Symmetry: D2
Subunit: 726 residues, 4 copies
């Protein structure tokens, strides 16, 4: 029952490209990668090699294959305490999943600022470009359960736990700059509306159902984040290729006591990229773990996810200077009006060891701030502060959740709190209250000040009556959806139309669809008309005459709202499928792999069976996967080298591979007789932008292919894909 003699059961502890080695726990894959938080977990990491198998009480087990029974065909006996411990632990493995964001994928890393920000914040982690802060980041979807699929259409969560010298700061953000609703009190209504419906618990991972669109049609405040969800922002290529936002106006407080309003951003250094809907939807079935896997493999490969933290800063005196309210979380601050100032870089460079212990039990909460930061009266943020501490009592079993290893501060913590379920810390303090004389009042309060001081709230002025009332300034719902729509490229606009059209077609009650198209007519008539046409709805004369909402402080558009209007592609970490034949032209493959390696682009070698094939020069080529086993959905581009093309020319799966990739706007490159496949995707002899072709793969051929990949997808192909049956 043992390891192969050749050692092939164990992954090399060195960076390796995706699929080259089995994946492994981070501490075993990359044992030399360290940071302060990682090292602090060593008290709880448990190895295994050369140790005896035991009960949890440390009793060695002789036979872990059988229950104790009276004769070898007799009843199992109650005194089998080894059986009952083992089965009891198994019977109690699951804990409640997160109410929202249950599906998520996490890694360790570090952050450092580019320069001291002491002029605007006294936060210690932003104070010195050479002070490194460990982080643990979890990316998530929102609606689906922990076992739902990754590449759904949904908002994404992006939560960073900063283990600072002055306490834990959690920046708990999402991949769009707003939310669907204005006041925390409605959160259970909105979440119930988008979640599976209560009678039958359908659908999983999808807003495409009657209750979501019912809520939206009745609550126009939602329309801004709906526009974002219906765009390709709803279906990112990778957690490495989406933006992060902190969602609310918070405050930075400097040593002098000055408050600046701030909104937080994460800029992906790998660039912004998304799937297209047919690809995303099909990929939920071909690999529901695609984003989790891609994140883990990028880190094992050394393509560490990097993000730049950025702040929009608004002086306190400018609070009212926009035509929207700064505290309204359904409103974004356009970068044309307030630029993002670069602040630092975050690098994720190690996977966890055990997903349950580190990912599933991690608790992030936006109320976990540190001196130098503060809140605002954003009425969504305000209610969040209640929820993230409350929910842990059931999810994590009690108030000692900060003692779960992933959650522990690396900064000291000492206070007079005691007891609670599964209390780990054994307090020696004679006193469990203050003020005390019997321990000379330790641990002691600390005055606020420039560094290492106690937390004091910014003394914001409050004047008003106790009311349950929405601010009149929040009562505008259409201008930001319009700004978003107008900032998208024409192909991005088409994809938004198609997203709404697809979703509303699954709404069973036709009046709901009508009411949504009526809302759309208040944003933009062209959008409204294009969705109506797809639903067989005709706009009324009144709907045709609805005045468009006002520009946002004079803006007709803001290109920073588009995924693609300003090129920002980075190919490093992307992946190509190489379709093999049984006699590959080795000269072609040599050139292909050389050019890919030079740009840090990975390759997977595919064939019609597993095992090996041999190239024209005798090189034995191991096969990563079959055409069907690793579909074009999972790669960025497809290359077909020359050789014995007859071997695959008539293979339905190989032909389909190219039809799917073509339909999904991916670059395709065909060398030598591989150009015979031009017939399957109807490319004219003259060729076509987005199809690289030549007698052989070479300098010029790979440069062209790599240029295409830098632009992500071949948007000019869109008119040609209606026709292809794929």
């Amino acid at each position: 029952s043992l390891a192969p003699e050749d050692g092939s059961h164990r992954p090399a502890a060195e960076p390796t490209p995706p699929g080259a080695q089995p994946t492994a726990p981070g501490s075993l894959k990359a044992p030399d990668t360290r940071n302060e938080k990682l090292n602090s977990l060593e008290d709880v990491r448990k190895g295994s090699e050369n140790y005896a198998l035991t009960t949890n009480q440390g009793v060695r087990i002789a036979d872990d294959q059988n229950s104790l029974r009276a004769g070898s065909r007799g009843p199992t006996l109650l005194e089998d305490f080894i059986l009952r411990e083992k089965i009891t632990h198994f019977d109690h493995e699951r804990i409640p999943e997160r109410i929202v964001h249950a599906r998520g994928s996490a890694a360790h890393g570090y952050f450092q600022p580019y320069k001291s920000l002491s002029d605007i914040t006294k936060a210690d982690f932003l104070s010195d470009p050479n002070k490194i802060t460990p982080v643990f980041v979890r990316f998530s979807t929102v609606q689906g359960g922990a076992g739902s699929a990754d590449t759904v259409r949904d908002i994404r969560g992006f939560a960073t736990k900063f283990y600072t010298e002055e306490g834990i700061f959690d920046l708990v953000g999402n991949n769009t700059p707003i939310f669907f609703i204005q006041d925390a009190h409605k959160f259970p209504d909105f979440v119930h509306a988008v979640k599976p419906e209560p009678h039958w618990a359908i659908p999983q991972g999808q807003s495409a159902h009657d209750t979501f669109w019912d809520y939206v049609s009745l609550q126009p405040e939602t329309l801004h984040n709906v526009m974002w969800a219906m765009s390709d922002r709803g279906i990112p290529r990778s957690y490495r290729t989406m933006e992060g936002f902190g969602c609310h106006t918070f405050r930075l407080i400097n040593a002098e006591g000055k408050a600046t309003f701030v909104r937080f951003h994460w800029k992906p250094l790998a660039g912004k990229a998304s799937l297209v809907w047919d690809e995303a939807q099909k990929l939920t079935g071909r690999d529901p773990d695609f984003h989790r896997r891609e994140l883990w493999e990028a880190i094992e490969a050394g393509d560490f996810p990097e993000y730049e933290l950025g702040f929009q800063l608004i002086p306190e005196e400018d609070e009212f200077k926009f035509d929207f309210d700064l505290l309204d979380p359904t409103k974004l601050i356009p970068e044309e009006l307030v630029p993002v100032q670069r602040v630092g870089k975050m690098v994720l460079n190690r996977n966890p060891d055990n997903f349950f212990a580190e990912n599933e039990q991690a608790a992030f909460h936006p109320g976990h701030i540190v001196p130098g930061l503060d809140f605002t009266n954003d009425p969504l943020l305000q209610g969040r502060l209640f929820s993230y501490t409350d929910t842990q009592i059931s999810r994590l079993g009690g108030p000692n959740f900060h003692e779960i290893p992933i959650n522990r501060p690396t900064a000291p913590y000492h206070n007079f709190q005691r007891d609670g379920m599964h209390r780990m810390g054994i307090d020696t303090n004679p006193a469990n209250y203050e003020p005390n004389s019997i321990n000379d009042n330790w641990p002691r309060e600390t005055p606020p000040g420039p560094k290492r001081g106690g937390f004091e709230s910014y003394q914001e002025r409050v004047e008003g009556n106790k009311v349950r009332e929405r601010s009149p300034s929040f009562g505008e719902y259409y201008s930001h959806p319009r700004l978003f729509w107008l900032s998208q490229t024409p192909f991005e606009q088409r994809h938004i139309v198609d997203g709404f059209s697809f979703e509303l077609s699954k709404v069973v009650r036709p009046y709901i669809r009508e009411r949504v198209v009526d809302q759309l007519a208040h944003i933009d008539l062209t959008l409204a008309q294009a969705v109506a046409k797809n639903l067989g709805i005709e706009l009324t004369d009144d709907q045709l005459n609805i005045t468009p909402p006002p520009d946002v402080n004079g803006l007709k558009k803001d290109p920073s709202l588009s995924l693609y209007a300003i090129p920002d592609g980075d190919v490093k970490g992307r992946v190509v499928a190489i379709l093999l034949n049984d006699e590959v032209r080795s000269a072609d493959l040599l050139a292909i792999l050389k050019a890919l390696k030079a740009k840090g682009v990975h390759a997977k070698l595919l064939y019609s069976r597993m095992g090996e094939v041999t190239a024209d020069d005798g090189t034995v080529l191991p096969i990563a996967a079959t055409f069907a086993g690793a579909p074009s959905l999972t790669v960025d581009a497809v290359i077909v080298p020359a050789g014995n093309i007859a071997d695959i020319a008539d293979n339905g799966d190989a032909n389909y591979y190219l039809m799917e990739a073509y339909k999904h706007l991916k670059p395709i490159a065909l060398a030598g007789d591989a150009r015979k496949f031009k017939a399957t995707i109807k490319i004219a002899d003259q060729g076509e932008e987005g199809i690289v072709e030549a007698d052989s793969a070479d300098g010029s051929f790979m440069d062209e292919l790599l240029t295409l990949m830098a632009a992500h997808r071949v948007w000019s192909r869109i008119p040609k894909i209606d026709k292809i049956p794929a």
Copy 2:
């Protein structure tokens, strides 16, 4: 008044084919379908129409659109107990999912024997062809979570709760007549091997990964149920078109004290039918709720699932 005037928001309370009407809670869709268990649940069913919105303490809520704050742009106050009750209940909605068979779809129905089986068993529910026993049945996959997809390749669970006059009898079976392993002490090894692997929690709803096949390779006792799972048995068209089995030899005991060994079977009256792999896998993406949906809509149409 937000409902449309034409009343098209509300499904007809009569049998209707899949897609014809929105789906609904069973007591609304089919109020006149009753059995002893369904009737006994009436003490806890809560309606809604014509009732005022309240806290859990029965206090009417005037504004369910806003938190209480000091000024309409000011901070939310701690004394907002309506907000806090509502968000507290939300924050604690979830309970642990089942360790296995977390993904499952269920319905109410009834059982009746063809004839008295008193010669072989004194079980009251099998004593009289005119004795009707309410059931509640839950069909499931095995490996994936509660939010995993329906049409994966996996074993299916088929659990029937019989509410008999002499106590609950649960027949907790699967859609193949055997299991992977021989001794319960190995159950956590086997389940850990098939479940998502522990470093990264991949893959969901799939035995197609190293640790499952490593365990199979070292434990040849598994090969029988593996054969079943690799066949199209692993990818049923519908819970209505798969077989059920009680897995073990049990005993029947009659009034005279005689024991007879028994294995239990369910025969689908709709016939046996399965998908093909490419179809099943693609379907987990196009509709991960396909079997849950099909079961609910068959029942709403009158195509009641029947099993012998």
Copy 3:
């Protein structure tokens, strides 16, 4: 600084007698004490001196006196995360108490065997006289809640966690050798019956109510342990002065595979000693924490509780050699038939740091055995095996209760169990199953063997049908109660009579008293008639004529069953009240204290107020407590030195002090004019045995008093007490 300038807030970190210093956490009181288990808890100990006060997230708090509000008289804001974290933790401090034995007191210590027992067991902890095994021991009552009183009449638990090199071994015993019932299926019935009655939840800490005596009257199997409970065994003086027993036959298994039957014993090296009923009852009012306090103070003083472990050993071939069944846990094995072999010594030498973390969270379970031990078919032990694992899932929050620090093995533990609530260990094993090849099958099973082998059950032969049936061999109920009764002294018999009589008088339904009296008539007529007389019940002619049960294997008594038949007194750690006056004779007091010191006996100096008084010769005498404040219930003897007796001669409290101690059979010593107090307890001029008196407090005055203390109480005094109004 809040601490006083003179440092009197901090207890001396050295052994001090009870009352001399405030008590402290063990690691602060006795930092130099250590053992392997205490060392291994260091990673979770939290200090406090010189640290800042923080949130659990490590954020320094500036003001720990106020909530955050909108103006200093305004409403509290939801954004006050520091308030909600602190109040959240408080709100969830409590965990379920233990179903039974909820009230208990615990200490750390160590165990060492006198010689290797490898000829009879391969248990590692017993294999070498140099092997020292850390322990943690919790003593308890059974019925009352965690906040009930110590000196109730009840069975006591005595549970020892041995942290061995081959696993945790928990020896979960009580202070009597048997239990009330035979089969574990009845445990919830018996426990419900003794516990507070379900309509009104009365009475706490008492079996003196209808449902207990109903159950007993209907289940004569209970009578044996009821005899023990009704004797002074049910009201021990101290956890240090009671016996411990393992309750069941277990097995020892040597390296050759030979099984020997064993029953486990603890012998108190401080000797056997119990209160009397009136004293124990009043003491639950005057100090409901008396045994907890006594234990903690003994350890702080260096009077470490010490116990000798002993084994009764029965060869397998002697299973059926007795008049009773070895597996019947209502039957004791008389030491006259099977002597206790001494095995080793345990010493308890360090208090915990935090009572909740170490005591309340500790989990003991008799299924926790190690290679070299095994179970038997005792049907009470059999069902115990199920309960002690199960109960922790709610009490301690889930299946990772072995990760709570006090419960952790010091031995290695490695296995394939994963997850569960509060999971601390982060497993790096690529495998969570076996057999596996991907980690070369580690951690691996270990064959059984002579040392460091895997656990294998002893291959006992099982033969019979599947039945729910009591063995006919267990159907004898009276001979062991009779042997117990006959083995007691006449004063111990009187106290049994009075225990039944007092308990049955609290039973409201008379027929239940009558039914119990009928049971007693089956044990011993003298016993039965004496209890009947106290209840106004007359035994029938049939009752008068019940043949007594047989002797047990020819024995008509066994003096080891008596607390006092065979003297085993030890005065070290006992306490004397010294009653002061405003002008004490300093030469009496010097002599008193000098002799008490030489025998390790403590003293408390008592007066009518606090502060100090001054001796005839100007010596300043500090007062520990007032007469009312430290009643005679709390001491073992009373001494009144000479001097200004007139000062206290008419003090009600001072007089009553001597009356109460006199009533409770305690030694009393009077010097010089303190002899005037002889009037208040009605002592004749020639004196009486148990009252020491002389012109001055020496020559042989303190030897006399110390001799009386060594015999614990003045049993001869019993006839004279009924005439005293106290």
Copy 4:
């Protein structure tokens, strides 16, 4: 939430209101009430928005907080009047 096991402690019999209670809260450990409402959110059209909010009034109205005037800065400070 720890003492009584979860957020449905109002369904424990002694705690239950005798007044009606209806709302859009769902699930939680040991959930007794089986809701038949097609909607679990408001505003909804699919159940004509029931159960519905009630304006405050002299009898049988919804709860509205007294509109006390609040003026001051966000402070952690004891009122001098308490000293």
